Amino acid sequence: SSGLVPRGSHMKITAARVIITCPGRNFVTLKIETDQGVYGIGDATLNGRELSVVAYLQEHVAPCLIGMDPRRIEDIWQYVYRGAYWRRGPVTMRAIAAVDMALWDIKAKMAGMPLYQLLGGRSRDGIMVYGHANGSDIAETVEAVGHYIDMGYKAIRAQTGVPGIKSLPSVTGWDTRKALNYVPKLFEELRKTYGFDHHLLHDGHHRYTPQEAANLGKMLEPYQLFWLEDCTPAENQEAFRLVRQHTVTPLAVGEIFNTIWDAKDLIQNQLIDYIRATVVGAGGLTHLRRIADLASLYQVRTGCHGPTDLSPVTMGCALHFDTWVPNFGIQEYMRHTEETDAVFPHDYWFEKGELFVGETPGHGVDIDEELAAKYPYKPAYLPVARLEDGTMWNW
């Protein structure tokens, strides 16, 4: 135990500080300190819009937290969620997520337990991950998939450039017919080359209409994909209906979701197989648990998004979540830079296509503030996409 407060005594948040660092890329971290001595940290990173969350926390949320009882995780979650008045949203839920992660960090430290024990204990040993096999064309993407296979990955996401298709935001091009003609040939070549033992994933990256996604999903059926992800924009939760009606290719969505309200109909109408919402994107452990539980009712599984723009603090929480959650499906894993790992020392590790969470009380991650200050913030944007005629599209 990090130290329990005496029975009948109070505990207060004394500080809620935002720390910004760029050890390879931008990360925002909230550190909640207490009068007991124990502290907790949470990820607040919102890629390409980082400083909006910094201000949300520093100027608005943090001053409200001071003096509050950090043990009251649920109450504080409801306070910042309901109390915002303007509810939901990428910036809002990142701030909430940062607070929630930091508070669960504190509770696990005080309990003298790794976080997964507080959530209900372990349901599995290792956490299956997928890696990112990218190529400019099919031949190259095929070779990249082989590399991940050699490395012992059980699951691989395969993405290829399409011939004829191409810090401020980089502008990229897109054409759907070109992709529809080419993408199924990638998966054909992959199965010809490697057979059917490995899980193969594809990210449609919001590019298709529902009918087009249905078309693509059908064309991919002979290749038995693990999932086709983010096939069509999903602000309208009815957008997956035609896709689900027409294909048995499994469907995943939700890396950009921030509350259960973004996913409730996709889940209850059985339009998806994997929910991709994350601890940082969707309001911390407190809220992600709700999302996972609703999904479980329909046998929908978790497939947490996990690019490098979710810091190791997020990964730590994600792995504790993954270790416990009964309807675990898979965990995305893109490796952070060495500098990032140094700034955020953590008790999780990778081995032969699986991540494993450690037994350190808390979520097992910390932040080296002295080292973090050596890497100053540097603006960086996500790309945008335009159609061939110049139409603004979904990158």
Ligand X SMILES: O=C(O)[C@@H](O)[C@@H](O)[C@H](O)[C@H](O)CO
Taking the mean position of all CA atoms in its chain, how far away is CA 245? Answer: 27
- Give the one residue of 14, 17, 35, 64 binding a copy of itself; rule: CB under 8 A: 64
Residue 382 interacts with ligand X (CB under 6 A)?
yes
Report, in angstroms and rounded to the nearest whole number, the Rg of the chain calculated over CA atoms: 21
Sketch the per residue contact string, 235 through 264, with Mg ion: x for CB under 5 A, - otherwise.
Answer: --------------------x---------
Does 203 help bind Mg ion (rule: CB under 5 A)?
Answer: yes
Beta strands in 88-233 (DSSP E): 127-135, 155-160, 171-174, 199-203, 227-229
Cα separation, 244 vs 105, whole angstroms:
39
Cα distance between residue 376 and residue 126, in whole Å: 35
Q: How far is the CB of 300 from Mg ion (least distance, A)?
A: 17
Is 264 a binder of a copy of itself (CB under 8 A)? Answer: yes
**Quick check: 328 binds a copy of itself (CB under 8 A)?**
no
**CA-based nearest residue to 300, from 244, 368, 362:** 244
Which CB atom, from 8 or from 86, has the smaller least distance to ligand X? Answer: 86
Is 309 annotated to bind ligand?
yes
Strand pairing class (27-34; 13-21)? antiparallel
Give every CB contact of residue 184 below 8 A, 6+ residues apart in sequence: 216, 219, 220, 223
Quick one: which of 66, 76, 71 has its CA closest to 118? 71
- Which of ligand X, a copy of itself, Mg ion, none does 309 bind, CB closer than 5 to 8 A by kind? ligand X
181 annotated as ligand-binding: no
Binding of a copy of itself by 5 (CB under 8 A): no
- Residue 307 sits in the site that holds ligand X (CB under 6 A): yes
CA dist., res. 192 & res. 188, Å (int)? 6
Q: Is 189 a residue that touches Mg ion (CB under 5 A)?
A: no
Q: Is 10 in the site for a copy of itself (CB under 8 A)?
A: no
Rounded least distance, CB 70 to Mg ion, Å: 32
Q: Pattern of binders to Mg ion over 64-93, x per CB under 5 A?
A: ------------------------------
Residue among 18 and 128 whose Cβ is closer to Mg ion? 128
DSSP string, 29-95: EEEEEESSS-EEEEE---TT-HHHHHHIIIIIIHHHHTTS-TT-HHHHHHHHHHHTSS---HHHHHH
Question: Catalytic residue at 205?
Answer: yes
Name the residue among 312, 313, 281, 311 with its Cα closest to residue 302. 281
91 binds a copy of itself (CB under 8 A): yes
Rounded Cα distance between 330 and 353, Å, is 11
Q: Which does 90 bind (CB under 5 to 8 A by kind): ligand X, a copy of itself, Mg ion, none?
A: a copy of itself
- Give the number of C-alpha atoms closer than 13 A to the C-alpha of residue 264, restricted to the C-beta side: 5
Closest CA to 356 of 134, 126, 152: 126
The answer to the question of residue 309 lying near ligand X (CB under 6 A) is: yes
Q: Assess 332 for contact with Mg ion (CB under 5 A).
A: no
Contact between 295 and 268 (Cβ < 8 Å): no
Q: Which residues contribute to the annotated binding site?
A: 47, 132, 203, 229, 255, 276, 305, 309, 332
Residues of the shown chain interacting with Mg ion in the complex, contacts defined by CB under 5 A: 203, 255
Residues of the shown chain interacting with ligand X in the complex, contacts defined by CB under 6 A: 47, 85, 203, 205, 255, 305, 307, 309, 332, 382
Residues of the shown chain interacting with a copy of itself in the complex, contacts defined by CB under 8 A: 46-56, 59-60, 63-64, 75, 78-79, 82-92, 168-169, 235-236, 256, 258-259, 261, 264, 281, 379, 381-382, 384, 392-395
